[PDB]
């Protein structure tokens, strides 16, 4: 068994807000292709 | 975009899937049966040479949850101990040289098989597990047929079968060979012991090897299994003569404004094969089916040959292929009225400039693919074996003649596969002698544009429907915005050209 999706949403609510803005805007300018997106996770 | 789909087909050519990892979870009713082999020595009939077990096949048909399932079960034993009982050295005393008995140390094997899908092509399995319930198996009453004397009867004996590991096996026979599942069971002796009556043997445990079935028709135990196996994705393993006419009937019924609205969308593989209400097999293998034929055509071969000739023109230079080059020097983008001939020959590679991402405008192959996607969602006659090589005949025979242009310091040089060339100024449309050996040097490296708005209609428009500087620059640049604005302003000098493009997109 993996999770209850309600509790996984609560894990998101634990990762609510704390993304930096310079870092987010620099992260959203990358071609995060399949390899990069499913390797590091 | 609509040519990017062709470029993507070419890119994913290496994929030209078939297998799959499927999960099966089904209930089953294991109705098995034992079998004994009673061998009787010669003499009078008081002496028994052996009483052993035998592999016991049983084939039957039972009712699942709304299914009528045919099945086949093969029982066997392993590690049974051998006991003996001698009453004397005479032919007239009841003696059993050897009889087999069951205890903890032994094991019971059961090969199980059905006619369902889980067993049709089971050759590879992993993550195998199973939930089985325990039962009790007891021996009956085997009366030793003594010609004369008393009647010894082997009676009693019970054992509790507890589940154990599962594996694979193969049931062989003189008729059929079945790739089956091997259910293994461990044993624990029960309270009722086995005993032969009118004989000095009693209060001993196990299961008698004489009549283990107890006169029953089978021993029924339910179970469930789960696995992950390999299976062909196609779940079955264990006649253009009229198509062209359908295309030419569907050609002009299609509209123009909405078609131009649709010819700007990157209708990638999903979007191109989603609106097709395909068959269960086509939806699984459509893309690879069309690709294995798309990389067989004049288009693909010409692309690969241009690439081979560019490689060979970069390498050969010391022995440089001197076939011909008008312009600066050999490029293989310009390889050859003489002027009209050269221009047509260069335009038969400007089609490759088009489907090489080195264009700026409506990129005629894009219009061709839009017509394709607008026709193959309407045409009733579309099928898995049918779309392959229709996509290619489309890509090959849509807009055979097509023109291009290049701009340099406000001077447009046109060209066409139909042997026509036109030089002219942007602001003031007036022809000029066509500057060959400069048009080539420019079209080679500078970007090219397509002739959707070609000079003839352009001049007719600049004459009748007087045109502004920005509108004319955008029409030279082949802008879909101004194109659709004219198409909504209902300009027949553009509607006619678009209708001509449709009628050339005929197949």
């Amino acid at each position: 068994l993996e999770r209850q999706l309600g509790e996984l949403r609560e894990e998101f609510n634990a990762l609510s807000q704390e993304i930096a803005m310079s870092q987010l805007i620099d992260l959203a300018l990358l071609p995060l292709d399949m390899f990069s997106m499913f390797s590091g996770i | 975009m609509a040519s990017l789909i062709y470029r993507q087909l070419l890119t994913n050519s290496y994929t030209v899937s078939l297998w799959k990892e499927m999960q099966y979870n089904r209930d089953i009713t294991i109705r098995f049966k034992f079998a004994s082999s009673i061998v009787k020595s010669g003499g009078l009939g008081y002496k028994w040479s052996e009483i052993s077990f035998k592999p016991a096949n049983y084939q039957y048909t039972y009712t699942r949850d709304g299914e009528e399932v045919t099945a086949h079960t093969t029982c066997s034993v392993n590690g049974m101990n051998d006991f003996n009982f001698n009453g004397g050295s005479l032919p007239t005393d009841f003696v059993i040289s050897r009889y087999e008995v069951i205890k903890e140390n032994s094991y019971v094997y059961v090969d199980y098989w059905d006619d369902s899908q889980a067993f049709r092509n089971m050759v590879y399995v992993r993550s195998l597990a199973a939930n089985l319930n325990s039962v009790i198996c007891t021996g009956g009453d085997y009366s030793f047929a003594l010609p004369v004397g008393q009647w010894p009867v082997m009676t009693g004996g019970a054992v509790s079968l507890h589940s154990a590991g599962v594996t694979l096996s193969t049931q062989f026979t003189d008729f059929v060979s079945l790739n089956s599942l091997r259910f293994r069971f461990r044993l624990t002796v029960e309270e009722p012991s086995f005993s032969i009556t009118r004989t000095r043997v009693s209060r001993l445990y196990g299961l008698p090897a004489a009549n283990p079935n107890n006169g029953k028709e089978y021993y029924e135990v339910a179970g469930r299994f789960s696995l992950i196996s390999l299976v062909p994705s196609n779940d079955d393993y264990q006649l253009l003569g009229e198509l062209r006419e359908e295309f030419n009937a569907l050609s002009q019924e299609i509209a123009m404004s909405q078609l131009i609205d649709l010819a700007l969308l990157p209708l990638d593989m999903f979007s191109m094969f989603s609106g097709i209400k395909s068959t269960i097999d086509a939806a699984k293998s459509m893309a690879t089916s069309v690709m294995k034929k798309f990389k067989k055509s004049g288009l693909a071969n010409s692309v690969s040959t241009l690439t081979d000739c560019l490689s060979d023109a970069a390498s050969s230079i010391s022995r440089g292929a001197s076939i011909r080059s008008v312009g600066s020097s050999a490029s293989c983008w310009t390889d050859v009225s003489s002027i009209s001939t050269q221009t047509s020959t260069i335009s038969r590679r400007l089609r490759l400039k088009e489907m090489a991402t080195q264009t700026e405008g409506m990129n005629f192959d894009d219009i061709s693919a839009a017509v394709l996607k607008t026709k193959i969602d309407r045409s009733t006659q579309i099928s898995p074996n049918t779309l392959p090589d229709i996509v290619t005949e489309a890509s090959e025979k849509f807009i055979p003649n097509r023109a291009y242009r290049v701009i340099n310091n406000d001077e447009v040089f046109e060209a066409g596969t139909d042997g026509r060339f036109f030089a002219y100024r942007v602001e003031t449309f007036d022809e000029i002698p066509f500057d060959v050996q400069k048009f080539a040097d420019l079209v080679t490296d500078s970007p090219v544009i397509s002739a959707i708005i070609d000079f003839k209609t352009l001049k007719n428009l600049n004459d009748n429907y007087g045109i502004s500087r920005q509108q004319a620059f955008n029409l030279l640049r082949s802008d879909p915005r101004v194109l659709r604005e004219f198409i909504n302003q209902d300009n027949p000098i553009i509607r006619n050209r678009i209708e001509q493009l449709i009628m050339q997109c005929r197949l």
Binding site: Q4 | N25, N131
Partner: protein
Amino acid sequence: LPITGSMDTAYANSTQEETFLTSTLCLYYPTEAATEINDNSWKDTLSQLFLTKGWPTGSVYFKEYTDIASFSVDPQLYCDYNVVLMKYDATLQLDMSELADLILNEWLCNPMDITLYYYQQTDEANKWISMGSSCTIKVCPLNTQTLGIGCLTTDTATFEEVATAEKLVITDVVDGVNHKLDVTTATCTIRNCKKLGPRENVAVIQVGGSDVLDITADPTTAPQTERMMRINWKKWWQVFYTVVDYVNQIIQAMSKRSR
């Protein structure tokens, strides 16, 4: 749709003495009460009494029920105002709480096919309610690849028993795992039901001990609503006279359904 208003408007007249005339009332009393009373015209008597409060004679109904469990077995409450009288029994605490959880709340119920499908609960209000003469339910959770956890999908003995010989059951299990079930489908029918907004049309009245009903399956609220009332008793005529006299309070605590 949206609704506007204002605070400058005035309060309207009392809808009482008209809601009585254009509504119906339905009492649900136990056979014990009729027994202790031992009279044939007590219904006519109570209706003539209600007629003083304003409820006309052809508006009040009395619907006897032999036992709380027999009542919990498919209670067909179809009236514009329902009152229930409920005895207290420690041995029947969970049953008389499930009855409340069933009638006080309005349930959106779908059927269930155990033998053919396996089900799971999505939110905290998607429960499994079984009704019948004698229910005996057992549950086996499963994992991602349809294998049992402390149970066997085939061996019914290895299942976990949650109900035994219960006429009504309300089962909440862990929300996010697929369960297999074993139920006496012959004698009990089971539905998967999501709890909608409460039923403001029924009023439970506990005739005996302290307030024990815990509607909320979550053991943190334990709320006591407006239409879950209590009385201490030594006779039944006193209870019925109390109900009669304070019916207006009960009908102010209740509100006609919206559906």
